[PDB]
């Protein structure tokens, strides 16, 4: 990936969750388990369905009869028709193949972008209260009770209320 979040600083995917493309795996003193994010992957589904709709439906086609018949005394016009059909074949084959490959790269880049944006959102939301331990994981400098996971997963985490205990426990860690 071009953002380094699909096989980037996050190495492998998670088969443990089923409820969306983008999610979380969290464990604390009271529970554990997967918790898929909602809004980001919902927007992802919306944009991907618009993408496939645009790729499929924007090609409009009218009624036509590409089958032509010619006799023995008019081989030239038969070869002209064959050239026309063959040229259409090459145009369509190349345009379709390059469209497929470019859109494949584009949608993989989109997914990488989405997961990196989710990581950047959580990183900016938590900042110094958490330690980036690599592989897309944050270790809190405190023991967050509930609504901490929930507010992280919907982008409304209250920073300064936990900051006092975070920095109090921080002094024990970094001298």
């Amino acid at each position, epitope marked *: 990936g071009l953002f380094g979040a699909i096989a980037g600083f996050i190495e492998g995917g998670w088969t443990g969750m089923v409820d969306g493309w983008y999610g979380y795996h969290h464990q604390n003193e009271q529970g554990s388990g997967y918790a898929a994010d909602l809004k980001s992957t919902q*927007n992802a*589904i919306d944009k991907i369905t618009n993408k*496939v709709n645009s790729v499929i439906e924007k090609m409009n086609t009218q009624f036509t009869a590409v089958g032509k018949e010619f006799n023995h005394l008019e081989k030239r016009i038969e070869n002209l028709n064959k050239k026309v059909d063959d040229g259409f074949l090459d145009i369509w084959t190349y345009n379709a193949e390059l469209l497929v490959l470019l859109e494949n790269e584009r949608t993989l880049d989109y997914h990488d972008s989405n997961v990196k944006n989710l990581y950047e959102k959580v990183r900016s939301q938590l900042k110094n209260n958490a330690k980036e331990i690599g592989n897309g994981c944050f270790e809190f400098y405190h023991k967050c009770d509930n609504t901490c996971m929930e507010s992280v997963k919907n982008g409304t985490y209250d920073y300064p209320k936990y900051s006092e205990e975070a920095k109090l426990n921080r002094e024990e860690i970094d001298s």
Partner: antibody
Framework: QVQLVQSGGGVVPPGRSLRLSCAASGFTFSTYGMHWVRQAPGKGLEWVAVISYDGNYKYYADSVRGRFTISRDNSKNTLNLDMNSLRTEDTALYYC??????????????????????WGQGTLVTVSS | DIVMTQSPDSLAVSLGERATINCRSSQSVSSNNKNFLAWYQEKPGQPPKVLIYWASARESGVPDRFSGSGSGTDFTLTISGLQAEDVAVYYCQQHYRTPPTFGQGTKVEIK
């Protein structure tokens, strides 16, 4: 012109299978998802099931999960609903509906369906001995 | 899942006046400046047809007297000049989660 007609319903004692078919015509069927929805007598509507355009992924509500089997045959533009393990509460009036999001993709169990464009004429299913 | 309630139920007004019914959802349904709500109307012996989709638009063939609005969790359906042929039942329907849920329903009828 979109048309949705369904039949095959009637009276049934609990414990025997019943099959419904909602044939569709007048519109591009294979590019749209379909839904099942029912009207309990004296109550309001509630969702039953949904099938996507390719037929790979299906979903059901929390009341009929593990008992119904939604199916589809795009070669005949025919929607089908295998319907087993009955109880008395299951009596209602069944409608087949079409989603609004063209060629919508359903990959998980919380996504946003489209609104229901057009409905079937309704067939009666009841559970009595 | 998500449940909603239409507070006026079986309200009765005569011809020509205004009829207002609200719709309060358990959680927020609207996303990215778009309203994910639809209204349905059924007459006795007829399947419930779509009345207003996306809570602001209108299905072709619906009279202009039927209009609706709303945002967030609260939405309203308004009837401008009720006609005697519009005695029916109205429904809410949030198509945001895989279990679309219909409201308990309200009735409009002559006074």
């Amino acid at each position: 012109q979109v048309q949705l007609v369904q039949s095959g319903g009637g009276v049934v004692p609990p414990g025997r299978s019943l099959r419904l078919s909602c044939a569709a015509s007048g519109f591009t069927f294979s590019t749209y998802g379909m839904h099942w929805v029912r009207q309990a007598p004296g109550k309001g509507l509630e969702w039953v099931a949904v099938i996507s355009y390719d037929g790979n992924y299906k979903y059901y509500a929390d009341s009929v999960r593990g008992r119904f089997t939604i199916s589809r045959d795009n070669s005949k533009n025919t929607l089908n609903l295998d319907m087993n393990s009955l109880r008395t509460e299951d009596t209602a009036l069944y409608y087949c509906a079409k989603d609004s999001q063209l060629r919508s993709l359903l990959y998980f169990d919380w996504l946003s369906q489209g609104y229901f464009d057009h409905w079937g004429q309704g067939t009666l299913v009841t559970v009595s001995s | 899942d998500i449940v909603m309630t239409q507070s006026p139920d079986s309200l009765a007004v005569s011809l020509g006046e205004r009829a207002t019914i609200n719709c309060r959802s358990s959680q927020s349904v609207s996303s990215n400046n778009k309203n994910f709500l639809a209204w349905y109307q059924e007459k006795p012996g007829q399947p419930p047809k779509v009345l207003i989709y996306w809570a602001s638009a209108r299905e072709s063939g619906v009279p202009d007297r039927f209009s609706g609005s709303g945002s967030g969790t609260d939405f309203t359906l308004t009837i401008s000049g009720l006609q005697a042929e519009d005695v029916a039942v109205y429904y809410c329907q949030q198509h945001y989660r895989t279990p679309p849920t219909f409201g308990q329903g309200t009735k409009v009828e002559i006074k």
